[PDB]
Design a protein around this ligand. Structure first.
Ligand SMILES: Nc1ncnc2c1ncn2[C@@H]1O[C@@H]2COP(=O)(O)O[C@H]2[C@H]1O
Ligand SMILES: Nc1ncnc2c1ncn2[C@@H]1O[C@@H]2COP(=O)(O)O[C@H]2[C@H]1O
Lengths: 200, 200
DNA sequence: ATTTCGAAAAATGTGAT
DNA sequence: CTAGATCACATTTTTCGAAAT
DNA sequence: ATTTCGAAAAATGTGAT
DNA sequence: CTAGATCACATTTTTCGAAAT
């Protein structure tokens, strides 16, 4: 569309290879990102290094907006590329110039925040009310909805490690493993290595 | 300030008593609120009633905005009022227009969304990385930031039932007290009935 | 591109406490 | 009372860098 | 109307499980 | 294991509406 086009025009495009880091938690925030292609992972670490995945973002999604609204803000999390990415970049200052000449570009970003908030609040509840099995069940169902999910004859097929699932639901990798085995005993999913098919 | 004044102008200001709910999770959202005076608690419930305080929102905060950007959306959580509230209302439709002739108001809202994202995100970290003690600890510091909080000569002072805290960190009324005492013991806080002083 | 190949790096199951 | 977290490695699985089609 | 007062509800302190 | 949730009570704080002011 005419807007998310005149926008990329004022953006410096960059390419990150898979697994590379795009945003270091704690660093000064002054740049704003928009994913033209590929997908990233937004995660936070603890003093020990343990990682918790807050979300996956993809083509169309903005990154690093949380710093644009006030001076003195440091990145709130790490953002590591899930796949090779093509990322549009622009400075906050160079961006507020744009809001003042078509705030629609702002509504689009804002909508995306509104969503992230809802979604992240959702996770808070999951963590607070559901046991691990529920959270894992829930995550598999979500993961199956992500765009990087392939379609399988018996449902939707996905690739993820127990380690990673454990970093989404916040439980150990061992536990994920046992739970995965029980969901299969109940013919809910067929687990084979990193390939997990979620039955329709 | 100037703008926020202009905004209120088009808002059908109202009055809400304490314990009264402003938003019902699940209903169609078509209204945007603004707390002129008072304070509210945004909260969510489990399948059987349990509550989780996502956040306290005071004066100057907007309410029911996640419904503003997309269509056919439902309120994402319950919003009850702590003290008595003076809440400015306004329809999304009329609001959207207000933005048209001055995107600065939309900026303000978005700024508030951004901080709510960070905070909710940091809440996820806490729930996944910390044990109750750490959670209760962390909440205490935070509660000692809300406007309804007085200033003590040692740190700060607030009023909150052990029940509430149990609902903000996500643990039982018991655990909250047990760990609370341990806190007094290890001389780090000052408690008594429903009053607390955090040492800084 | 993606297919194949042989390391080399990562992810796993274990199961009593 | 009780969901899960732990712990160290031998054993799997997957990823990786180069040669091929 | 505002305040004062003594049941109820709400909130706790516990130790065991 | 081992933080925490539960359970079943006795014992305080607060909450509130009626009654005094
Ligand atoms: N809860 C979340 N959901 C989605 N994206 C997030 C979340 N928390 C942080 N991020 C993204 O990660 C970025 C980290 O740096 P910023 O704070 O600049 O901006 C943040 C967002 O782009
Ligand atoms: N995690 C949160 N942090 C802060 N405010 C929130 C959060 N979740 C919901 N809200 C507010 O609660 C409102 C509930 O209804 P809406 O979804 O219309 O808009 C929501 C926000 O204004």
């Amino acid at each position: 569309d005419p807007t998310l086009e005149w926008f990329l025009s004022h953006c410096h495009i960059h390419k990150y290879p898979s697994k590379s880091t795009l945003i270091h938690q704690g660093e000064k925030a002054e740049t704003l990102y928009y994913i033209v292609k590929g997908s990233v992972a937004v995660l936070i670490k603890d003093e020990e290094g343990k990682e918790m995945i807050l979300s996956y973002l993809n083509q169309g999604d903005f990154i690093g907006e949380l710093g644009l609204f006030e001076e003195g803000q440091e990145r709130s999390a790490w953002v590591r590329a899930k796949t090779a990415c093509e990322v549009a970049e622009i400075s906050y200052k160079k961006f507020r110039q744009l809001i003042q000449v078509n705030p629609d570009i702002l509504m689009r970003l804002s909508a995306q925040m509104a969503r992230r908030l809802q979604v992240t609040s959702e996770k808070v509840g999951n963590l607070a009310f559901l046991d691990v099995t529920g959270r894992i069940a829930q995550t598999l169902l979500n993961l199956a909805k992500q765009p990087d999910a392939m379609t399988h004859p018996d449902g939707m097929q996905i690739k993820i490690t127990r380690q990673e699932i454990g970093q989404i639901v916040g439980c150990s990798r061992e536990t994920v493993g046992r739970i995965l085995k029980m969901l299969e005993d109940q013919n809910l999913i067929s687990a084979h290595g990193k390939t997990i098919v979620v039955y329709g």
